[PDB]
From a paper:
Through adaptive evolution, these variants acquire mutations in the spike (S) protein receptor binding domain (RBD) that binds the cellular receptor human angiotensin-converting enzyme 2 (ACE2) (1–3). The RBD is the primary target of neutralizing antibodies in naturally acquired or vaccine-elicited humoral immunity. We demonstrate mechanisms through which the [name]-[name]-2 receptor binding domain (RBD) can tolerate large numbers of simultaneous antibody escape mutations and show that pseudotypes containing up to seven mutations, as opposed to the one to three found in previously studied variants of concern, are more resistant to neutralization by therapeutic antibodies and serum from vaccine recipients. We identify an antibody that binds the RBD core to neutralize pseudotypes for all tested variants but show that the RBD can acquire an N-linked glycan to escape neutralization.
(A) Cryo-EM structure of the [name]-A3–Fab [name]-[name]-2 spike protein complex. A3 binds the RBD core with the spike protein trapped in the three open RBD conformation. The trimer model shown was generated by superposition of an RBD–[name]-A3 Fab model generated by subparticle classification of the RBD region onto the coordinates of the trimeric spike protein–[name]-A3 Fab complex. In agreement with competition assays, A3 interacts with RBD residues that overlap significantly with those of CR3022. Among A3, C6, and A6, only A3 competed with binding of an ACE2-Fc fusion protein, suggesting that A3 blocks cellular attachment. A recent molecular dynamics study suggests that introducing the glycan at N370RBD in [name]-[name]-2 would favor the closed conformation with the N370RBD glycan stabilizing the closed RBD structure on the trimeric spike protein.
Residue numbers in the entry:
A (entry chain C): 540 to 620, 641 to 676, 689 to 735
B (entry chain C): 295 to 343
C (entry chain C): 932 to 1147
D (entry chain A): 736 to 827, 854 to 1078
Write the structure that this text describes.
Amino acid sequence: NFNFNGLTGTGVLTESNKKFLPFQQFGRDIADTTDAVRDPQTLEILDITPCSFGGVSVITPGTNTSNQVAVLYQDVNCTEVNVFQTRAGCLIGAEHVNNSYECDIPIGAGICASYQTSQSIIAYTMSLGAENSVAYSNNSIAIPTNFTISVTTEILPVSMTKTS
Amino acid sequence: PLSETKCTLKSFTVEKGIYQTSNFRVQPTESIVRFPNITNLCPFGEVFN
Amino acid sequence: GKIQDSLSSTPSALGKLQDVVNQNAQALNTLVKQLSSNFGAISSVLNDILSRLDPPEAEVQIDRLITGRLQSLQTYVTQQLIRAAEIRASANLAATKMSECVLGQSKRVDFCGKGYHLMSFPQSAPHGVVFLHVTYVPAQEKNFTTAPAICHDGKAHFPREGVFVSNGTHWFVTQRNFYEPQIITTDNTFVSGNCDVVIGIVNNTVYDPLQPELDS
Amino acid sequence: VDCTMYICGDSTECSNLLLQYGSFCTQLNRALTGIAVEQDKNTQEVFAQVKQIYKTPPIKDFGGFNFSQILPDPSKPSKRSPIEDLLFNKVTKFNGLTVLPPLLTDEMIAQYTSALLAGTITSGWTFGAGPALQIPFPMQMAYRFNGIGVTQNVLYENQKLIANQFNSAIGKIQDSLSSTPSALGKLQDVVNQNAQALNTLVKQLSSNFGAISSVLNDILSRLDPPEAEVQIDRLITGRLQSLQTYVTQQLIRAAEIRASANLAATKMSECVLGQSKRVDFCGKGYHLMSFPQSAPHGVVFLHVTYVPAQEKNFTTA
Ligand SMILES: *[C@@H]1O[C@H](CO)[C@@H](O[C@@H]2O[C@H](CO)[C@@H](O[C@@H]3O[C@H](CO)[C@@H](O)[C@H](O)[C@@H]3O)[C@H](O)[C@H]2NC(C)=O)[C@H](O)[C@H]1NC(C)=O
Ligand SMILES: *[C@@H]1O[C@H](CO)[C@@H](O)[C@H](O)[C@H]1NC(C)=O
Ligand SMILES: *[C@@H]1O[C@H](CO)[C@@H](O)[C@H](O)[C@H]1NC(C)=O
Ligand SMILES: *[C@@H]1O[C@H](CO)[C@@H](O)[C@H](O)[C@H]1NC(C)=O
Ligand SMILES: *[C@@H]1O[C@H](CO)[C@@H](O)[C@H](O)[C@H]1NC(C)=O
Ligand SMILES: *[C@@H]1O[C@H](CO)[C@@H](O)[C@H](O)[C@H]1NC(C)=O
Ligand SMILES: *[C@@H]1O[C@H](CO)[C@@H](O)[C@H](O)[C@H]1NC(C)=O
Ligand SMILES: *[C@@H]1O[C@H](CO)[C@@H](O)[C@H](O)[C@H]1NC(C)=O
Ligand SMILES: *[C@@H]1O[C@H](CO)[C@@H](O)[C@H](O)[C@H]1NC(C)=O
Ligand SMILES: *[C@@H]1O[C@H](CO)[C@@H](O)[C@H](O)[C@H]1NC(C)=O
Ligand SMILES: *[C@@H]1O[C@H](CO)[C@@H](O)[C@H](O)[C@H]1NC(C)=O
Ligand SMILES: *[C@@H]1O[C@H](CO)[C@@H](O)[C@H](O)[C@H]1NC(C)=O
């Protein structure tokens, strides 16, 4: 918590590269939030970045399979908090495995989690599907010789309960 | 964390997935009151001395 | 039968309708809970405010409750109007799907389920509709060599329906979605141009059904 | 947006006063979470229409059709086509307002559009319905022409001309997007409206709403509880009304974006995974094919259509 000459508020003060004019006492961001201050005794410019915060999300398989969970602290470092730093946040409790698989619990920024054989929670960069290549060539065509009839189910809501 | 998830979902069974259960903050450690340097001190000298 | 097993086994199959029920229930449950909030008033229960305070100040606390509960209703109604717009969009989609998949055979790709649409069946469901979309999916395929055209007398014959395929030694013409080779004849192909323009034309023999009859 | 940090950030007295309003903040957080989830559903529905990731061969002989301006450029750092690079280069957490990463990052979305392009190019529309069945591109176009009532021979006899017209038209797309600032207004408007909504929401913290000061600590540092609570309730009402306005506007805009995403998913299904016969659905003319490209917060389709150009007066019967 800082009080620079009646300007008040919580944050982390760090050494800045900003060049205030001799008479300006505090830098303000685009939307009128204080971004930097002049320390009144040593006339140096400090940036104010707000104190780290974010949601805490619990990544779990179901309580029908396991009571082991991983916790994601969103959009922060793994210093303020088997710890895996991801773009989505700091993931604690999941193991990092490089081989990709289909996303099971999405975490974010490409990272998904799952419960796999240990039999532990893992995190990985999701696979988008099995890779393929169509054996293209200028004189070759693939033609089906057999077929299946499939039935798919499309479920749509039509109405709400008529509350009055 | 698992009990927090159960309380958030109001259930003793939690389905597979990711659930937001709380909000983490980094609490202010020190209250720093830093202020300008002290100059133009009032002429109590003359009156008193 | 697989649809029956699929829908029964996983309970989540109808989540798209269950969510709507849940959201409406949550929408009302919150609204009912909002009656217990003070919104700054001395008590959330109106009858204790009237029974405890004289008019000039009880009216102030009651106005505080009126603002809070009216704003709560405005929130509920706004959320219901937006959710109703979502459901209206779903209902309009369902009516379009009923028109085009059930009352017809849609040619809109993936409108009426993956594959090539053959037909659909509605089924009712609480607060919504479930369509069983019956589609044709090609399932086994083979590598054939192909050509855009064939040369027979210097004229280029192009298939009238389907494509030319080769099983390695012979050329056939076949319907594009199901391997069914036919002998290439003048009733399977049409003639346009000649051999010196088409890139990829291959030499072949086109059978003329009339000649055997004229000799016979 | 964290309603409690936004309204009553790092103030216990204010938080205790906010708790007298019951469910308003949990409801706002729930609505914003629902929107945030929906945006990943929107991206999934638009782009994850292919189960497998298809690739074109190293041989690019497609009968003269030059797709090098839509196909991924391996040389660059993020495997994007040049047109995708123009689109990305052409589009421009404090108080509890935070931004979540999208589930599918730009590289994965580029991979999905690459899979869709390789599928379209090497198997026509068959990768959409079922197994992706290879067909030579000039034969795919022969089907695409036959699909609009133009006999196959028109492509084959005019293949070189058609391939050159296609390549020229794509180059013109490159120039059109490159030189005109306004081509991507539809996505820039979305970015701008969200930025304006959040700058407005943050600026609302500076309003008094009838209170002596917009700064919560200056009320707490000046006034004794029984009256500072009145001023704080004034600020809570104003700031909560500000969040309700923001969230309602976001819900309505999200409904608009959902409609756009549903249209984009329909267009990918019917224009990219097939050959639409819906007039002006897949651009003016008669639809032959279309190509997805990723773009920040949206999708750009290149619709390739047949337009008659020169005509003659015949007598008929
Ligand atoms: C009236 O005059 C007297 C003496 O001239 C003042 O008293 C002096 O006050 C100063 C205040 O800074 C004292 O200085 C001290 O010096 C020591 C070491 O020299 C240092 O460690 C301290 O931190 C402090 O700076 C000084 O000792 C003291 N002298 C006496 C005899 O009291 C008095 O302050 C004057 N009147 C007013 C109203 O100031
Ligand atoms: C206040 O005193 C310090 C000595 O520690 C000095 O360096 C500083 O310059 C003074 N204040 C100003 C505004 O100069
Ligand atoms: C999940 O729960 C069902 C009953 O609800 C049970 O039959 C099943 O065994 C559980 N799953 C596992 C992996 O045990
Ligand atoms: C914060 O995270 C970045 C990477 O996201 C890392 O480079 C940096 O060292 C971290 N800082 C702290 C203090 O943890
Ligand atoms: C892949 O996983 C192994 C652990 O088995 C690890 O040593 C290696 O560094 C990982 N590769 C990368 C690129 O992180
Ligand atoms: C086609 O598949 C069915 C089962 O899906 C099989 O019974 C039938 O023999 C197959 N036909 C051919 C020609 O392979
Ligand atoms: C067609 O041939 C390619 C290689 O020439 C092969 O990868 C592909 O599996 C073949 N198609 C089928 C249906 O086996
Ligand atoms: C057969 O193909 C050759 C090209 O190698 C061509 O010169 C010849 O004219 C073709 N035959 C006929 C009957 O067109
Ligand atoms: C191709 O089909 C013809 C039918 O006329 C048959 O005689 C020939 O043996 C077949 N060749 C192959 C490789 O299947
Ligand atoms: C196909 O490409 C090969 C080279 O890979 C070339 O020799 C041949 O002439 C081409 N054929 C057609 C029909 O384009
Ligand atoms: C057209 O294709 C050729 C390869 O055949 C390639 O070298 C050229 O760069 C392509 N055109 C453009 C504008 O990239
Ligand atoms: C067809 O005839 C009309 C006469 O009314 C003329 O205006 C038009 O230009 C003619 N079209 C062409 C293509 O010459």
